[PDB]
Amino acid sequence: GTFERLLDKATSQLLLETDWESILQICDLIRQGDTQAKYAVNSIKKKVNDKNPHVALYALEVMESVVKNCGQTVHDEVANKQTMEELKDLLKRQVEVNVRNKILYLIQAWAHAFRNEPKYKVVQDTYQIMKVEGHVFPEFKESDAMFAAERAPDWVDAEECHRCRVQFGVMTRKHHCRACGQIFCGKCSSKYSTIPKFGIEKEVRVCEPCYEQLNR
């Protein structure tokens, strides 16, 4: 029950300012895998759509933080067509300027944050649409779009290659994919890539599926 208690606490109409303690605990729960991102983001979205603009604004601040801090598992839940449509709709019916302004702030911030990720293009597409419709965005600060690097996965040991199942031995050395942490023979891990999301800016060994996910 902790995620839910905290979300309630963070979006209380009693608050005079952002409850950073509760927000950062919510971020930690998602990063640690204690709370699933889809459920978390769905729960926050329910609050974003509240008729009370204080609740909606506080919920948008929770959304801002989970996106900034929680990595791809959360980005997958916001940088999609369903969410962009819901925010376009919300922005169109919202009569409260601070909620409106925050939606614009976030769309702009995310569109810049996601500029290297083709799977997330719908956010930049939505930004451009909104500008054509006449929305005046707040001035952009680089700081808005600077997200926390994610933690690279721990490496797995095993007796055989994760892909081809060859047995490791003297003539078949163990290697690891830096992107997923699984264990491979050399034949199955002969690709090299940067991994920006983990702050890896040198080309490091990856498996073939990770290589293709990374080099779209």
Annotated binding site for Zn(2+): 161, 164, 177, 180, 185, 188, 207, 210
C-alpha to C-alpha distance for 195 and 113, rounded to whole angstroms: 15
Query: Which of these, 115, 132, 128, 59, lies nearest to 90 by C-alpha position?
Result: 59
Distances (CA, A) of 162 to 168, 179, 189: 11, 14, 10
Q: Which two tokens stand for residue 173?
A: 């050395």
| Shorter beta-carbon distance to Zn ion: residue 145 or 204 | 204
Are 174 and 162 in contact by the 8 Å Cβ rule? The answer is no
Tokens for 87?
A: 């925010």
Q: How far is the CB of 154 from Zn ion (least distance, A)?
A: 13
Amino acid identity at 166? V
Instruction: Give the nearest distance from C-beta 183 to Zn ion in angstroms.
Output: 9
Triad 60, 65, 70: Cα angle to 5°? 130
Looking at the Cβ atoms of 40 and 188, the one nearer to Zn ion is 188
- Residue whose CB is less far from Zn ion, 31 or 178: 178
Taking the least distance from each CB to Zn ion, the nearer of 44 and 207 is: 207
Distance in angstroms (rounded) separating the CA atoms of residues 34 and 29: 5
204, β-bridge pairs: 193
Closest distance to Zn ion from the beta carbon of 181 (Å): 7
Residue ranges of the annotated binding site are: 161, 164, 177, 180, 185, 188, 207, 210
CB of 185 to Zn ion, least distance (A): 3
Complex with Zn ion: residue 45 or 197, whichever CB lies closer: 197
Residues lying near Zn ion in the complex (CB under 5 A) are found at 161, 163-164, 177, 179-180, 185, 188, 207, 210
Write down the least CB distance from residue 171 to Zn ion, Å.
13
SS3 assignment for 37-61: HHHHHHHHHHHHCCCCHHHHHHHHH
